[PDB]
Amino acid sequence: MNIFEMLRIDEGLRLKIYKDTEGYYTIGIGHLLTKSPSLNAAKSELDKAIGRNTNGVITKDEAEKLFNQDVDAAVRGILRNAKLKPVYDSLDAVRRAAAINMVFQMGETGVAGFTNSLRMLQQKRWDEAAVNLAKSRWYNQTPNRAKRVITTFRTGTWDAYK
Ligand SMILES: [Cl-]
Ligand SMILES: [Cl-]
């Protein structure tokens, strides 16, 4: 198991524009297009992302190409962020994957809001960080996904994904 397989499980794959769990136009493997309520706005963001006239539909290669860019962008967003980077550097490889999953889903700024959790993660107080991570809109809106990521942070294993 690795970050790509983890995110592929949590996000799924859809080859046509769909609304994510918040109601936002999305495509592929969790690639958010726009928060605007306009499907035309989504279609135009999509053509721009892919570099051709898609009419709301993409291929698997194309979905997987966006996914690669989004994973890379998430990693690079952690390393450039002064609150996230030291926590990430402190973590082992499995728990690093959990951090990237979070940034991927909610963005670098959203995760950097988990100040107390981030500090407990840096100190390797895993049960405590797991409890605190769950006191969140994130956990309450997407509890099954949030439970899998939390378990990953708690145990440093892939058990929640097997
Ligand atoms: Cl893009
Ligand atoms: Cl969920």
Task: List the CATH number of the domain containing 34.
Answer: 1.10.530.40
Beta carbons of 149 and 101 less than 8 angstroms apart: yes
104 is in an annotated binding site: yes
Q: How many domains does the chain have?
A: 1
Q: Determine how many CB atoms are found less than 10 A away from the CB of residue 38.
A: 11
Of 159, 153, 109, the C-alpha closest to 134 is 153
Question: Ligand 2: distance of its center to the CA of 52 in Å?
Answer: 32
Resolution (A): 2.2
67 is in an annotated binding site: no
Q: Which two tokens stand for residue 57?
A: 């539909």
Residue showing tokens 């107080």? 125
| Method used to obtain the model | X-ray
In the chain, where does DSSP find H-type helix?
3-11, 39-50, 60-80, 84-90, 93-106, 108-112, 115-122, 126-133, 137-141, 143-155
Domain enclosing residue 46, as ranges? 1-162
Enzyme catalytic residues:
11, 20
